[PDB]
Amino acid sequence: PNHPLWYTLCDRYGLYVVDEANIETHGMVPMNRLTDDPRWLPAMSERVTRMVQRDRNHPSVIIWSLGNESGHGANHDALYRWIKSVDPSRPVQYEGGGADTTATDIICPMYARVDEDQPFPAVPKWSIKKWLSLPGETRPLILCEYAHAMGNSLGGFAKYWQAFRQYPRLQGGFVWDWVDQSLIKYDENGNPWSAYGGDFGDTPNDRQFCM
């Protein structure tokens, strides 16, 4: 959840908002070790429920998100249903555990390509065009992350937009991402420079992957 003023500004300037619970357990093995554990359901519920209680009157918020990269666990299904019960006015989405689980109203993969399948075991990234028509699938597809804008990037951005326009149920996506997470450091002469992972003696680190 963002600083409260963000929603006020989005209300007034006009931007559709995905409001997302502060739950990411990416580093667990497997990713859902905590989110499938009922002992962690209380801590998780509060991150979802208090978000909804705070932000539910903002018109700019059109979709709730259960968090990010926390696999798919039974705790997601419970909280998915909690929101659906308290606020039927907004769809609920969540990408974890394969992007099309029982805990999401929207097929919301990250970095599924336009035409090319990536058939990972358990959590494949289908071609977005193919994903829509998988046997029994009926939901809209909006990528929670796509077109990874790292450095000299956005090759093939037009391919996504051609597909979005051609396919009714391909309803766009959220680019990753808006702003480089570089930090300012100063040299011996007081001249500013842009710094990334590892530039603060921080270790282990992941270098420029924050930009």
CA angle 144, 145, 149 (to 5 degrees): 155
What does the DSSP 8-state code read for residue 97? T
The reply to whether 69 belongs to the active site is: yes
* 136 touches, from another protein, Na ion, none (C-beta below 5 to 8 Å by class): another protein
Say which of 20, 46, 69, 116 is annotated catalytic: 69
Q: Token pair of 92, please?
A: 């609920």
Residue type, 41: L
Q: What are phi and psi of 33, to 5 degrees?
A: -55, -40
* 2 touches, from Na ion, another protein, none (C-beta below 5 to 8 Å by class): none
Cis peptide before 30 (omega within 30 of 0): yes
Contacts of residue 173, Cβ cutoff 8 Å, sequence gap at least 6: 142, 143, 144, 145, 146, 147, 160, 164
Q: Is 26 part of any known ligand binding site?
A: yes
The reply to whether 145 belongs to the active site is: yes
- Our finding on whether 136 is near another protein (CB under 8 A) is yes
Paired sense of beta strands 192-195 and 183-186, if any: antiparallel
Distinct helix (H) and strand (E) counts, the chain: 5, 7
Among 27, 135, 192, 204, binds another protein (CB under 8 A): 135
- Using the contact rule CB under 8 A, the part of the chain among 19-27, 99-107, 129-137, 175-183 near another protein is 129-137
Q: Which residues bind Na ion (CB under 5 A)?
A: 164, 170, 209
Q: Is 137 part of any known ligand binding site?
A: no
Nearer to another protein, 43 or 134 (CB): 134
Number of residues in contact with another protein under rule CB under 8 A = 3
What does the DSSP 8-state code read for residue 29? S
Contacts with another protein, 66-105, as mask; x by CB under 8 A: ----------------------------------------
Q: Give me the active site residues, please.
A: 69, 145
- Residues at the annotated binding site for substrate? 69, 145-148
